[PDB]
Design a protein around this nucleic acid. Structure first.
Ligand SMILES: Nc1ncnc2c1ncn2[C@@H]1O[C@H](COP(=O)(O)O)[C@@H](O)[C@H]1O
Length: 529
RNA sequence: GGGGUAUCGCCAAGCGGUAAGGCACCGGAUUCUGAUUCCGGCAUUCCGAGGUUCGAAUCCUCGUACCCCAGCCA
């Protein structure tokens, strides 16, 4: 439970409401991101818990920043997280003729006027946080003139910025938002839904409360910066003929450590090509987290864990990662792949290679097993051989024996070095009856797999508070390796997370993989203690 | 000037009757993955100071810190 649900239980109990109707209203100017997923879980989760409804409304009031590419991706990510909206997809532009009719009501009541103060001047007249504002010389025009001027606006007779419609409230209110907030501005820009029917567009504050009213939203939930704005929400609805009055409630937004959530900044990363695009596995977008190998059930668990409060907060990645780890430890079929490979040849090996049965899940027999090829020339990962090492080290030192995963206890006998003191092969004996572990891949039957080792995109915990967050990108955000994997990984479907034993959970990247050359993204690494 | 918020390293419950829970961290058991599982350890004290009470993180002062607002953006 959280404060919002306690409000909703009060409301039901008092008979204030009989059904709850919430809504998620993303503006289509970018891809959704883990912050948004907190709002999706909240809004759609309350709806299904209370057997209520939840609407998806595209808050498309600003044409010059929005594009149709984002409306289809947003529907796509909302469904992928596992949620569905009530009825049809709604759009603020559905209400464009309705909002205009309401603007005329406000004009006819003398509670709104066409102002002609330039964009610079309205700021000059607005006052400051300590000094009250002052009235526009245009504030007292006749209802009759305001109607005449607003239709001249609607019919594009005024240039952009040369006129706007404003609410007539109080230029000395301590709420800066109530100092005659603009209701309409002129934008000669094609809107991705209404084409060029309109060249006056409504501002967010006017649109938002009338839309919620029209859809019968019982509780508009949004983030803490809209607390002052609630005053204009209630003022608009108290001054127009509307039969209902939704209440707005605010919870704090999500801040994840080591990433930037503003869509203006994410957009710059994509635009200036510092990431592949919105769904790059380093992006904190929902589609990026999907390509990285996250599961919609892991993000719903994240939502569950981070709480819903009024407290400002920054969650450590350790929480996000904890969630995906728990999911994938349960559900990921195990496999073997070597990321940095050095050859290990068993000289004692008699034969052309056998087959060992490997479990698909070490603690869950139910997930079955597979036959993996064993051989004399295997591949091992570099860090698993040390020529000299102290007792803590339980991998292959040149003096002792290690078990190969699900195969033989081998015993280190002789290294062969590359001229630059590097080593090139290790020579070992194997005990024929032996069934400190290391993973391995039969060189003979190995599949070449590209591996993308992903790391946090930024090197500072709060890259947003930096004078230029771009200069604080982590250059090792992605390091591409070429390794080898057991041939069963030939049947990996994109978006099925494997646990590469003693490395991390990895998933195929449909965007780069092909046949013969797969590309595996590392979702997350194992808890290296 | 106005609107908000203070409980563990990060998050969070608590609604006058004696500080939950999760992540991270530190042990120690068990493991053919330095993983997983188990077991245990994690806030005499709740931003500070003062007052009410039998009893205060909860109530009442009076401070202090931080967040948010001056887009014709949302
Ligand atoms: N970081 C965030 N954490 C939680 N909710 C958010 C966050 N960013 C945006 N939202 C919510 O997402 C919805 C649409 O936001 P927007 O994408 O700015 O139009 C609103 O409910 C916002 O309050």
């Amino acid at each position: 439970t959280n404060f919002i649900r306690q409000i909703i239980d009060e409301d039901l109990a008092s008979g204030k409401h009989t059904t709850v109707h919430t809504r998620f209203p993303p503006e289509p100017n970018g891809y959704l991101h883990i912050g948004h997923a907190k709002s999706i879980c909240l809004n759609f989760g309350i709806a299904q818990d209370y057997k209520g409804q939840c609407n998806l409304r595209f808050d498309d009031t600003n044409p010059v920043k929005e594009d149709i590419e984002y409306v289809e991706s947003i529907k796509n990510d909302v469904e992928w997280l596992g949620f569905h909206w009530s009825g049809n997809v709604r759009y603020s532009s559905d209400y464009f003729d309705q909002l205009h009719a309401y603007a005329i009501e406000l004009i006819n009541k003398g509670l709104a006027y066409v102002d002609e103060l330039t964009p610079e001047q309205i700021r000059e007249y607005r006052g400051t946080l300590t000094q009250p504002g002052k009235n526009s010389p245009y504030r007292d025009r006749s209802v009759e003139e305001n109607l005449a001027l607003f239709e001249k606006m609607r019919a594009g007779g005024f240039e952009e910025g040369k006129a706007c419609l404003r609410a007539k409230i109080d230029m000395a209110s301590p709420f800066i938002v109530m100092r005659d907030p603009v209701l309409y501005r002129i934008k000669f820009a094609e809107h991705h839904q209404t084409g060029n029917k309109w060249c006056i567009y409504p501002m967010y504050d006017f649109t938002h409360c009338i839309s919620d009213a029209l859809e019968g939203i019982t509780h508009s939930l949004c983030t803490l910066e809209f607390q002052d704005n609630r005053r204009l929400y209630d003022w608009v609805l108290d001054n127009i003929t509307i039969p209902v009055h939704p209440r707005q409630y605010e919870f704090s937004r999500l801040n994840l450590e080591y990433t930037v959530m503003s869509k203006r900044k994410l957009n710059l990363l994509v635009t200036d090509k510092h990431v592949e695009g919105w769904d790059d596995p380093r992006m904190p977008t929902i589609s990026g987290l999907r390509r990285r190998g996250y599961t919609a059930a892991s993000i719903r668990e994240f939502c569950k864990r981070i709480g819903v409060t009024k407290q400002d907060n920054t969650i450590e990645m350790a929480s996000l990662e904890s969630c995906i780890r728990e999911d994938l430890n349960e559900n990921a079929p195990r496999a073997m792949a070597v990321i940095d490979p050095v050859k290990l040849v068993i000289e004692n090996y008699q034969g052309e290679g056998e087959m060992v049965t490997m479990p698909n899940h070490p603690n869950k027999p139910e997930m079955g097993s597979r036959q993996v090829p064993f051989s004399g020339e295997i591949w091992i990962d570099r860090a698993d051989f040390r020529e000299e090492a102290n007792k803590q080290y339980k991998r292959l030192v040149l003096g002792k024996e290690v078990r190969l995963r699900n195969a033989y206890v081998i015993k280190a006998e002789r290294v062969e070095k590359d001229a630059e003191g590097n080593i090139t092969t290790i020579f070992c004996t194997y005990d024929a009856d032996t069934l400190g572990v290391i993973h391995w891949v039969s060189a003979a039957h190995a599949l070449p797999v590209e591996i993308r080792l992903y790391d946090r995109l930024f090197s500072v915990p709060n890259p947003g508070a930096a004078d230029d967050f771009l200069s604080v990108i982590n250059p090792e955000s992605l390091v591409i390796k070429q390794g080898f994997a057991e041939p069963s990984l030939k049947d990996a479907v994109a978006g099925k997370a494997f646990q590469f034993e003693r490395e991390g959970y990895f998933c195929l990247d449909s965007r780069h993989s092909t046949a013969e050359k797969p590309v595996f993204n590392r979702t997350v690494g194992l808890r290296d203690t």
